[PDB]
Swiss-Prot record, chains A, B:
Task performed by this protein: Forms the portal vertex of the capsid. Probably involved in head assembly, genome packaging, tail attachment, and genome ejection.
Superkingdom, taxonomy of origin: Viruses
Sections of the chain in a coiled coil: none
Subunit structure: Homododecamer. Interacts with the Cargo protein 1. Interacts with the major capsid protein.
Source organism (scientific name): Bacteroides phage crAss001
Subcellular location: Virion
Name of this protein: Portal protein
Amino acid sequence: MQQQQKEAELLQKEEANIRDNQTKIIIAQIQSE
Amino acid sequence: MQQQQKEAELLQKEEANIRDNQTKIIIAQIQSE
């Protein structure tokens, strides 16, 4: 359960980080308007 | 209970982080005005 504990928070950080990268490109396209 | 303790603060950080990303796009659209 401690591994099912930690594997959740490990994938939490990578998908949080893509979501910051997804917004950093879409802020650029509205600045390209 | 300690896992119900920690799973609350783990989802707390991811939804806090989307809410920062939600505001970083909406500040850009009013700057696109």
